[model samples]
Target: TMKVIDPQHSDKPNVLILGSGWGAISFLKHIDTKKYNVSIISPRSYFLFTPLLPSAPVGTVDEKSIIEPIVNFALKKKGNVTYYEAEATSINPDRNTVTIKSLSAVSQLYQPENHLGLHQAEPAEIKYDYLISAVGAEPNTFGIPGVTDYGHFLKEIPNSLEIRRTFAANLEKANLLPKGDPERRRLLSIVVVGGGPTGVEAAGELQDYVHQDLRKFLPALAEEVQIHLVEALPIVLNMFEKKLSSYAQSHLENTSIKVHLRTAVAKVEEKQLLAKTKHEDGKITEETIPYGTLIWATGNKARPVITDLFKKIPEQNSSKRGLAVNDFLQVKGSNNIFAIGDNAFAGLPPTAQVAHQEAEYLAKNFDKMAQIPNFQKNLLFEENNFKPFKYNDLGALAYLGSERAIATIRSGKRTFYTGGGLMTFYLWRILYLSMILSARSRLKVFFDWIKLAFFKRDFFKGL
Candidate 1:
């Protein structure tokens, strides 16, 4: 059994934050580090602003502009913030400890001639006084065969780079083939699965890249490039209002990007995706789409680490989403353990906004706890009383290529809807940049946007 470590020493608390994603970063930035010794552990050394990830695939934004180094941010704090580039494999809540394994090699302080170039790192277990798990979610493949082997995802920077390489390679391959051949046209086909915000934005950017930039560079194969978006739901952007959905569908159709609704992809082969279609009467039909590239953005599932923690809680037997947490962001039955970001199963939409809000709340509360004598007592009472985490439902936005977009704003009892034209597209871009955490990152992204608008996109593949 793992032994628990005591956090309270010399009247100062030790706060161990897990993951360097949006939620964890927000907490680290706003928390009163003066009263606590804070340490952060995450496999990633930098925090990625994921809202602009889709733009990175088409050179609309530089990849570096979207990342902020965690080390640089931690340096400004008063307390000790240890940023470890390691993944947390498991959590022992009973013992108040976590097991973390380094995902990469670290530079050694003293090395011999032969061992200088080699890695001598090993996994280590980390103990914490107060723990916050912000480990985010990954793309949900639903155990579908060949997906891990063949499909491409766009959740991370590397995945975006992979998609960009595959796309450029296919386009180049089409150009190399004999002129007027139908097979070459088929080889240039691209299929995108899922119609959520990420999928919609990716598809839109891809279409724009092919038509505007690729056409200028390689005009011969421009018309042959086909893009198809497949969605299992009845409509794209189902979470938005009906008017917004209609606008998005119409805009996408106008751009010549095919949208197949009620279509579910069953299996992904080497160069083809088999999909099933369901009708209103419950009739099903199957079809195969031949494509050279496939981007799988079928939404997210609870991370395995989070699910494992949920299983340990008997009271959370009904919680399939992940660990159940109270209003104060503390995991049920435990005050020392807290959850945020995608790992959190709070009764709220699993968006970056909610994660940021949770982190801000925890930071303020922690700060208050340091200044006041019974500050945590009120939060503890609220946790036991079952108060729901309150959130204001903001609007949703999606790009649809060629300076077109769809937006759905939720107000009290009614939703304001808008779509199409260059104005909305510019608005979408500005809104995302405004929400970016740092000024340096935001400025770099803004400059990248201007560069993309003025010059043709670079079609070079990373691989």
Candidate 2:
């Protein structure tokens, strides 16, 4: 049993915020630290910009440019904010406490007045007046064995690094093999599962990498390289308009990337993947395709931490995919714990735009709470105090290979102007570049794109 140590906040309420993802980072940005003592804990210290993560595997952008350190923003806060590069093991909502296992070295770095100078791996109890559960979801493998063991998911920066490592090593090894060797073809084959934006974007990037660089850079290996995209749904980019979806699919076909619709992956293997493909007839057939690299961009599932939290509040956890939350994004059973983003079943699509907006709304609500006289001791959470969250659909977009993309953005009069080709491609670039948080990162990515325009992509095997 670990003894409990008093937190730093005096009269102000102590807020224990979990995860350094989009929701957590956004909340931290808009939150006023003067009202509450905010403590942020997560395994990763940096917030990853996920939209640009796919570019990492092909060297289009550097990894560092996509992540911002949580502490960097925490230290700059005008109010009280503490950042812990650790994770919360379990929570005791009945006691308004959370059990955190902080590894060695953090105590020495951010020593507080009540901080016991305890060293080595240890458990500590942290009590909070309020808890904010913004911990994001994990890559959903659907209980596939080889996916967990061999396939690479496109969720985090580390995942991208590993994908690049696996693909590069396979391509390099294939380059050394004879032209007629079947092993060379197998080693060069690349498969991307999931027809969502992430999946389509990856296939597009891979195609560009193969044709633009490998074809001219390593002709023999390029001839062996094949990229295939499998979508379980009837169409790729199903979120977009029907016509635009076809445009993106046709564009991929023109780029020599096979677009397999109504295809679901049943099992994944070390050197091959078993797919359950759907035909025009309402029938399903299974086939195995040998490949050097498999990319799993299917969907996200609640992390174990989120799952445990859900199990504790089964009455409110009706959502099979994520935890259900009120209109204001508060967990039903929890008096102080709140959730947002993909983990928050708030009747909205899981997108960065939605998460950021929720964080902004919640911050304003916190400021409203500060107006209460006895807000610290007495909780007076009410719907009238803050406006209900409203999701603003900005539309969906995806990049196809060869300087082309599909867009379904609001053109005017609340109607979407759906189209594809070079215009959308330029729009896609300009949009994300402007959304980048830091000036340094924006400049780095801009220069990387400029460099790609002229120079050949570096094929330095990182495996």
Clashes of each: 0, 0
The C-alpha lDDT values of all candidates are 0.79, 0.80
Question: What is the C-alpha local distance difference test score of candidate 2?
Answer: 0.80
Q: What does candidate 2's lDDT look like per residue over 360-450, in tens digits?
A: 8888888887786756545245634556887777777788878998877763348656688898899999988987766667888898899
* Per-residue lDDT of candidate 1, residues 1-463 (tens digit): 4323343443566688888889899988998776877877788888899988888888878788999988767877766566657788888777777776654633211113123132224555557768888998888888777787888988888988898888788777778899877668767888889899888888888898888888886777887888899999899998876877888889888888999999988889987878899987899999888888889987688887777887777666677776688777888877778888888887788899889988887787676567655533324445334344567667788888878887765665676655556788878888898889888899999888888768987657863
Model 2: residues with Cα > 4 Å off, grouped in runs: 102-114, 118-120, 317-319, 379-383, 411-413
RMSD for each model, in Å, please? 4.3, 2.3
Model 1: which ten-residue window has the lowest total lDDT?
A: 107-116
TM-score of each: 0.91, 0.94
Clashes by residue pair, model 1: none
